[PDB]
Amino acid sequence: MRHSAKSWGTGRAMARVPRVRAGGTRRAGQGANANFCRGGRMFAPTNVNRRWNRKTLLSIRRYASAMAVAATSIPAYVEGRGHRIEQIENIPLVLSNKIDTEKTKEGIKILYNLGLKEELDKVEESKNIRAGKGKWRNRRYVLKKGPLFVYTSETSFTKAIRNIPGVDTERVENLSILDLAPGGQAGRLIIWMEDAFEKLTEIYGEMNEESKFKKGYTM
Amino acid sequence: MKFNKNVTASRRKNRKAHFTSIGLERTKLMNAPLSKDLKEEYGIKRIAVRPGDMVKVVSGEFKKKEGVVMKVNRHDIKIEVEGCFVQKEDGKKINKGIHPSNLRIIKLSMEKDRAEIINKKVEAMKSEVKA
Amino acid sequence: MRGNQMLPNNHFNKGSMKFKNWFNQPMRALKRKEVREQKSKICYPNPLKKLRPVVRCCSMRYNKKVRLGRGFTKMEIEKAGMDIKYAISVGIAVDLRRKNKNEEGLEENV
Amino acid sequence: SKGTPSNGKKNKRNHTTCCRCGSVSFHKQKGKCSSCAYPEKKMKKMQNRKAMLKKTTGTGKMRHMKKERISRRAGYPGNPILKEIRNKI
Amino acid sequence: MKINKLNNASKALSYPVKKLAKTEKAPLTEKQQRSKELKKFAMSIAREVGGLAPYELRATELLRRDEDKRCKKFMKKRLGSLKMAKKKIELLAEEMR
RNA sequence: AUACCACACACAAGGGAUCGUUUGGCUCCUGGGACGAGGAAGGGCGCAGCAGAGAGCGAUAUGUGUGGGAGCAGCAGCAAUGACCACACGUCCCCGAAUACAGCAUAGUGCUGGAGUACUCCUUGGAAUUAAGCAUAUGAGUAAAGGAAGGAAAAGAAACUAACGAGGAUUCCCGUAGUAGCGGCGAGUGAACAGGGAACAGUCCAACAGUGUAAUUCUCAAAUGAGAAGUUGUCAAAAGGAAGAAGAUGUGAAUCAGAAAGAAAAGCUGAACGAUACAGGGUGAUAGUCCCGUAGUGUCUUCUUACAUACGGUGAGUAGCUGUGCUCGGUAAUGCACAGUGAAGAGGUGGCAGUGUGCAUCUAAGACUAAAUACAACAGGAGACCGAUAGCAAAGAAGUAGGUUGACCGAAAACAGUGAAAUUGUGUGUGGACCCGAAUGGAUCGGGCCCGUCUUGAAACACGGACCAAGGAGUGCACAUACACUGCAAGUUGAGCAGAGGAAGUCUGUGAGGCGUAGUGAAGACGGAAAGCAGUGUGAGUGCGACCCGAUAGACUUGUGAACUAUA
RNA sequence: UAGGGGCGAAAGACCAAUCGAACAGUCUAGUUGCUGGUUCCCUCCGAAAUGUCUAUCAGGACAGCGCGCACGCAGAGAGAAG
Ligand SMILES: [K+]
Ligand SMILES: [K+]
Ligand SMILES: [K+]
Ligand SMILES: [K+]
Ligand SMILES: [K+]
Ligand SMILES: [K+]
Ligand SMILES: [K+]
Ligand SMILES: [K+]
Ligand SMILES: [K+]
Ligand SMILES: [K+]
Ligand SMILES: [K+]
Ligand SMILES: [K+]
Ligand SMILES: [K+]
Ligand SMILES: [K+]
Ligand SMILES: [K+]
Ligand SMILES: [K+]
Ligand SMILES: [K+]
Ligand SMILES: [K+]
Ligand SMILES: [K+]
Ligand SMILES: [K+]
Ligand SMILES: [K+]
Ligand SMILES: [K+]
Ligand SMILES: [K+]
Ligand SMILES: [K+]
Ligand SMILES: [K+]
Ligand SMILES: [K+]
Ligand SMILES: [K+]
Ligand SMILES: [K+]
Ligand SMILES: [K+]
Ligand SMILES: [K+]
Ligand SMILES: [K+]
Ligand SMILES: [K+]
Ligand SMILES: [K+]
Ligand SMILES: [K+]
Ligand SMILES: [Mg+2]
Ligand SMILES: [Mg+2]
Ligand SMILES: [Mg+2]
Ligand SMILES: [Mg+2]
Ligand SMILES: [Mg+2]
Ligand SMILES: [Mg+2]
Ligand SMILES: [Mg+2]
Ligand SMILES: [Mg+2]
Ligand SMILES: [Mg+2]
Ligand SMILES: [Mg+2]
Ligand SMILES: [Mg+2]
Ligand SMILES: [Mg+2]
Ligand SMILES: [Mg+2]
Ligand SMILES: [Mg+2]
Ligand SMILES: [Mg+2]
Ligand SMILES: [Mg+2]
Ligand SMILES: [Mg+2]
Ligand SMILES: [Mg+2]
Ligand SMILES: [Mg+2]
Ligand SMILES: [Mg+2]
Ligand SMILES: [Mg+2]
Ligand SMILES: [Mg+2]
Ligand SMILES: [Mg+2]
Ligand SMILES: [Mg+2]
Ligand SMILES: [Mg+2]
Ligand SMILES: [Mg+2]
Ligand SMILES: [Zn+2]
């Protein structure tokens, strides 16, 4: 909308679009402001007042996270997401405390002993450059999802495992649905810490009782 | 992962920083690895290539060749090595430039300030290594 | 205008009207946290907040509820054996505009 | 007639180069510049926002203002021969 | 609508508190007395030096003829307030006596 | 149809679509908010070995000092006697507030002027538009024009609310509320206290200064003197500190080889190794270990901040009143002015005019004040944004080339990639405008008027359309609503805001308000049926540019014009 | 000597190819009951050009005739016989 423009009106054998007032340049007499014009203004310009976020009831958020946690212990769902678990003895996995690990070298040896080798390899081999214009806008590489580790108490193991591709970490008390159901499909593979697994009873309570940690919520 | 928020991870910003570099930052672009023996003769692991030094080409058309560095083009980041050339229709021969990182140093040119440059870097290490 | 509705009344006629968005909400929250933290170091052993009296809310609708007020009165402070200069040094808030009109309200603040 | 033949008589020139602004707009008879109002003390009111931004600070060289910012950054150190005067003051 | 359900009689009820008596401030110290005396004194000297204003003369003249209700109306129109008029009439009356 | 016209296919022309790419734009967040008589901002002119534009710099037109260290892009010459870069300093032509000047203060030195003005304060003040016409009203105390200041500005410690069992400076957020009311009672307009929070801080002058001596400020001398201001009244006390924050910069792990194939391996295949570092960028195809970094760790430099005296209850052309004009939701006057008139020392107020009388709450006509709040230029970080007819007008010497008498107006052009259609030539085939149905070795047979659009009615002697590519029109927000889907249910809820957390996500508290749990009346007053609340979306109404394009007109400027033409 | 103003031996003539009210720029994307245009496929259902009121007659609103979702259900655009 920058330019000085006006319509020539009828009687000149031309369409009555606004035109640019100028002289000495090829720009004289060209068609100015409308959406059907080169260099004109777009239809309904995009605007900051749009509603970016969305609400969801707290009671649904609580219930969805509870049944996402449940699905992490049904083999049919875990396999269905594409985690491969052929070599793993039993689900769920619960690592002890008194893990005194500090180095990544010894950290991987632990994970291999739980049967996770094929799963981890599946992630490392996956790295590829994205198709389309997203590769220009800071979203260049894509990787497959792998195990999530959940802890509750501060331990050295967290900074021993984190550089291994596809390993992900969160605390039990603030466990998110984006981490528990990626892409909106449920049944992510989870490594529990022994403290964290016991805490699930305080957090979600018992059937037909009220949780002390989540006020006003019952299963 | 990066936890410092003052350093950029934008593709657009990293690329501009590369090509518009000047001064000492430009010199950092001309670094090459030293061979295993020289890494015992001197403390350093890598140095900026200069005329008169002796290099093995480890990638490309001229792989396996050895020779003396003739010239260093800073604007178009390339090094000319003695005896790496192409012949035109005329029979005339033109030296083809190689990117620094495809080379490896075999003998160092010790003319001029090189001995002081090396000393300055060794001291900078030890100062913090021994602490 | 057609059909049955509550008759419109939407006030968007004025062309000089300003809009205020709230995209800064999470960031300004983080700044307020960091200012309190550093303020808390400057006076380390002492609480960041002062002590305040309990008063009774205003109308017929809120009579039966008690709330924090602005400051203790010279009479409350004196009855508890302190002096005004000392009270300030120990982190008690003072308000010389307030008056005492009940026995009960005085006894509780003491 | 008012078209082509009247164009032949157009050999006088009412505006010359202004000494304040360069813009070939000083009207000799009126004694006034149509771009910048010379000889009035203040500069003229510009007609619109588009036209005034074409002549703002930062459209030219800003020689003095740039140096001042660098000196402020450095802590106004002054000429090193004369440090004792600075320090006393 | 959660408005206008009680009658005016029941809205007038109140809780039985125990009150505190007001602390009277009647004592006036020696220095405060001299302060007030000097101000009242100064007000005498001004009246002695400069005399009465035109409407005050016209007012006092009406008081001698017992034109009480005329004087009242006159003073109301000059000062605006019926209270100020009642006060100024009483001060003028006392001056004449 | 030998050669014209049309169509199909192959090759050569002609043009620049499409796909692949991007040292640019845009949006949000955080920091910053740094000019001038010591000559600014803006304009002109000069300076290179070969030098037009642009960049850089002033006749010192690549000088000095500090920290580094290898080349100067072409050609000729230079360079460890220091190429080039980074930090500071020195030098800095002419015009311009432009001043050998104007106004003004002090014992004296001096100060102001111009630039910028997004955000803040003070004045002045429209019309288009809506009311389906229009004059009060609306748009709007908005646009435009003037004055002024700072990193914020303004405001600020009750001549304040309230009628409770009361509270207690100012500013900001949630809310009371599209309510009480104002209104050709039409269109439309429209606040306050409470209740929940962020941040918190109070003080000065006058009234009212030692009289057994102006004890007070300044100048010159001197080691104790002269003089100026002032009795129309001067003079009312502490050093001091470690914390807190922002930058700059050093260091920083670990790889080799091969068949086939390619211009080139980093791919693929086997064997290893690092990780508190698998963020991201560069290398001749897709790299943790080839190069620059990153996680982790060192140093250094700046900036911010902190103890003393004496006091109260009368601040006048003011408050108020009469008339008048503007203004506000303020209504028998909410605020502000002008003219007449004009107080008391005791006065002001308690949303409806007057008079009286108790009761409650305050103290005007002098001043200062932090934090929590707003937003350009310039710098830094991010993104479900745009990808060269897009995104800023501008991805190159863009406010440029160029243009107006003037105020002012204003383009195109990416890769030495790919290479579509319109349109042209040559060769080879098939037809005489072309489509649909059905066939021959071969003449052809049957059916069909030119599309889009307003219209009772178009093949029309109704209008738009020469041809091809690319662009090109029901969208966003607020408020009620009916339906479909989801959780809980006499209840329900992501208000703001706090606590946790390598964090614009998520989890947990505290805790208002709103609507519902039953209605009737203008009201006093009375009382007796019917599941709701909050979301995710769809159809639809109203207001904002409101599906896209289009008037003749109206207003406003401290903007321009008598080079053509009129008259002195 | 400059725009609701100038200048005119008067024609509403002339004031930079513009004058029964100049030019530049802004408010402004002024308004429009009027003209033009409004971009993919198949399946199923399917109108009205009438009445009342209107500064109403090239426009609206309310009702009548379509479609979608449908709680439910003895009815019918035809005859007899009184
Ligand atoms: K415009
Ligand atoms: K928080
Ligand atoms: K010009
Ligand atoms: K100015
Ligand atoms: K000024
Ligand atoms: K109208
Ligand atoms: K209309
Ligand atoms: K306006
Ligand atoms: K202030
Ligand atoms: K103030
Ligand atoms: K208040
Ligand atoms: K409060
Ligand atoms: K390294
Ligand atoms: K290889
Ligand atoms: K390489
Ligand atoms: K006072
Ligand atoms: K007055
Ligand atoms: K005050
Ligand atoms: K353009
Ligand atoms: K030009
Ligand atoms: K090309
Ligand atoms: K080509
Ligand atoms: K038509
Ligand atoms: K016909
Ligand atoms: K027509
Ligand atoms: K709409
Ligand atoms: K228009
Ligand atoms: K004449
Ligand atoms: K004419
Ligand atoms: K006019
Ligand atoms: K019409
Ligand atoms: K049918
Ligand atoms: K009709
Ligand atoms: K209807
Ligand atoms: Mg555009
Ligand atoms: Mg694509
Ligand atoms: Mg002439
Ligand atoms: Mg002239
Ligand atoms: Mg009532
Ligand atoms: Mg009561
Ligand atoms: Mg009209
Ligand atoms: Mg009005
Ligand atoms: Mg208004
Ligand atoms: Mg303005
Ligand atoms: Mg005093
Ligand atoms: Mg590549
Ligand atoms: Mg008004
Ligand atoms: Mg009133
Ligand atoms: Mg492209
Ligand atoms: Mg463009
Ligand atoms: Mg010309
Ligand atoms: Mg007809
Ligand atoms: Mg035509
Ligand atoms: Mg298209
Ligand atoms: Mg409501
Ligand atoms: Mg009921
Ligand atoms: Mg439009
Ligand atoms: Mg009009
Ligand atoms: Mg009809
Ligand atoms: Mg028609
Ligand atoms: Zn000028």
Q: Consult the annotation and say whether E81 binds a ligand.
A: no
d(CA A171, CA A191): 12
**Dihedral angle at the C-alpha atoms of B62, B65, B70, B76, nearest 10 degrees?**
30
Q: Which residues of B touch A138 (CB under 8 A)?
A: 9-11
Peptide bond into D39 cis (omega under 30): yes
Are the C-beta atoms of residues C71 and C93 closer than 8 Å to each other?
Answer: yes
Q: Name residues whose C-beta falls within 8 Å of residue C75's C-beta, 6 or more positions apart in sequence.
A: C100, C106
Ligand 10 centroid, distance to E82 Cα (angstroms): 38
Burial of A30 (0-12, 13-18, 19+ CB in 10 A): middle
Are the C-beta atoms of residues B84 and B98 closer than 8 Å to each other?
Answer: yes
Are the C-beta atoms of residues A114 and A88 closer than 8 Å to each other?
Answer: yes
Q: Which two tokens stand for residue C73?
A: 């009165």
Contact E20 C101 (CB under 8 A): yes
**Residue keyed to tokens 């000059």:** E78
Are the C-beta atoms of residues A185 and A177 closer than 8 Å to each other?
Answer: no
d(CA B127, CA B37): 24
Q: Which residues of C touch A49 (CB under 8 A)?
A: 19, 21
Q: Consult the annotation and say whether E10 binds a ligand.
A: no
Q: Is residue A4 less than 8 Å (CB to CB) from chain C?
A: no
Taking chain D, what is the end-to-end CA distance rounded to the nearest angstrom? Answer: 79
Cα angle A50, A56, A58; round to 5: 145
Of A15, A22, A19, the residue nearest A6 (C-alpha): A19
d(CA A211, CA A206): 8
Beta bridge partners of A60: none
Q: Is nucleic acid strand F under 7 Å from A127's C-beta?
A: yes
Q: Is nucleic acid strand F under 7 Å from A45's C-beta?
A: yes
A21 φ, ψ to 5°? -80, 115
Using CB atoms and an 8 Å cut-off, which of residues 18-77 of chain C contact chain A? Answer: 19, 21
Q: Name residues whose C-beta falls within 8 Å of residue A210's C-beta, 6 or more positions apart in sequence.
A: A216, A217, A218
For C98, the 3-state DSSP assignment is coil
Of A182, A184, A211, A186, the residue nearest A199 (C-alpha): A211
Q: Is residue C89 less than 8 Å (CB to CB) from chain E?
A: no
Q: Which two tokens stand for residue B59?
A: 């990638």
d(CA B72, CA B30): 9
Instruction: Quote the DSSP letter at residue A14.
Output: S
Q: Is nucleic acid strand G under 7 Å from A23's C-beta?
A: no
Scanning residues 55 through 84 of protein chain A, those with a beta carbon under 7 Å from any atom of strand F turn out to be: 55-63, 65
Are the C-beta atoms of residues A218 and A209 closer than 8 Å to each other?
Answer: yes
Q: Name residues whose C-beta falls within 8 Å of residue C66's C-beta, 6 or more positions apart in sequence.
A: C54, C55, C56, C57
Of B9, C7, C23, D19, the residue nearest A51 (C-alpha): C23
Angstrom distances, CA of residue A73 to CA of A65, A90, A91, B95, C23: 14, 10, 6, 66, 39
For A94, the 3-state DSSP assignment is strand
Q: Is residue A49 less than 8 Å (CB to CB) from chain C?
A: yes
For A218, the 3-state DSSP assignment is strand
Q: Which two tokens stand for residue B48?
A: 């900026």
Angstrom distances, CA of residue B84 to CA of B52, B62, B99: 15, 7, 13
Angstrom distances, CA of residue C96 to CA of B31, C76, E43: 75, 11, 36
Parallel, antiparallel or unpaired: strands A93-95 and A190-193: parallel
Q: Which residues of A touch B9 (CB under 8 A)?
A: 138
Q: Which two tokens stand for residue B77?
A: 């980041």
Q: Is nucleic acid strand G under 7 Å from A13's C-beta?
A: no
Q: Which helix (H) or strand (E) holds A118?
A: helix A117-124
Of A171, A177, A120, A175, the residue nearest A150 (C-alpha): A171
Phi-psi region of A4 (alpha: psi -120 to 50; beta: other; left: phi over 0): beta
